[PDB]
From a paper:
The fungal Bromodomain and Extra‐Terminal (BET) protein Bdf1 is a potential antifungal target against invasive fungal infections. One attractive target is the fungal BET protein Bdf1, a global transcriptional regulator. BET proteins bind chromatin through their two bromodomains (BDs), BD1 and BD2, which specifically recognize histones acetylated on lysines. We show that Bdf1 is essential in C. glabrata, and that inactivation of both Bdf1 BDs induces lethality.
We adapted our HTRF assay to perform a high‐throughput (HT) screen of small molecule inhibitors selective for CgBdf1 BDs over human BET BDs. We repurchased and rescreened these compounds and subsequently tested the 12 most potent hits against CgBD1 and CgBD2 and the corresponding human Brd4 BDs. This revealed 4 non‐selective inhibitors active against all four BDs and 8 compounds selective for CgBD1. To better understand the different selectivities of these compounds, we determined BD co‐crystal structures for the non‐selective tetrahydropyridoindole 29 and the CgBD1‐selective methylpyrazole 63. Structural alignments reveal that the binding pockets of CgBD1 and of Brd4 BD1 and BD2 can all accommodate 29, explaining its poor selectivity. The structure of CgBD1 bound to 63 shows that the latter's pyrazole 2‐nitrogen forms direct and water‐mediated H bonds with Asn209 and Tyr166, respectively, while its carboxyamide nitrogen forms a H bond with the Pro151 carbonyl. The oxadiazole and two thiophen moieties pack against residue Met218 within a shallow groove defined by residues Lys147 and RPF‐shelf residue Arg150 on one side and Val214 and Ile215 on the other. Structural alignments predict a severe clash between these moieties and the (W/Y)PF‐shelf residue corresponding to Arg150 in the two Brd4 BDs and in CgBD2. These observations highlight the initial residue of the (W/Y/R)PF‐shelf as an important ligand selectivity determinant.
Residue numbers in the entry: 127 to 237
The structure:
């Protein structure tokens, strides 16, 4: 797992993103049948959401900050594939992706 200071930085980035209206579609895992999109898991083989990223950070399940960035990008790209590249949800994902990248560019180095 990444050292404490990087873990803290990523956690603060995630909390900042969670505060945003544009995060609302991404706060929790998708339940396809509950949303009457039963083909979701046929299209999306690696579901991802903000709660999972935060829990993984708390579980020290990331080895590098780039893995966090990869999971965030995967979440947004899942929306791009399933809802469409210009769908409302996808553009909200692009917005919070920009916010998260702003917070992650400032990630402190190991040494
Ligand atoms: C199928 N899927 N892929 C990624 C995410 C999803 C999905 O459906 N998650 C459940 C949702 C919760 C809130 C959503 C939403 N809130 C809004 C708006 C609020 C205010 C202005 S827009 N738009 O969507 S979606």
């Amino acid at each position: 797992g990444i050292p404490q200071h990087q873990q803290k930085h990523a956690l603060m980035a995630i909390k900042a993103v969670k505060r945003l209206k544009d995060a609302r579609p991404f706060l929790q895992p998708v339940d396809p049948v509950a949303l009457n999109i039963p083909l979701y898991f046929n299209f999306i083989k690696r579901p991802m959401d903000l709660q999972t990223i935060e829990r993984k950070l708390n579980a020290n399940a990331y080895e590098t900050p780039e893995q966090i960035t990869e999971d965030f990008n995967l979440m947004v790209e899942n929306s791009a594939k399933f809802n469409g590249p210009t769908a409302v949800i996808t553009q909200m994902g692009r917005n919070i992706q920009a916010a998260f990248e702003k917070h992650m560019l400032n990630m402190p180095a190991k040494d």
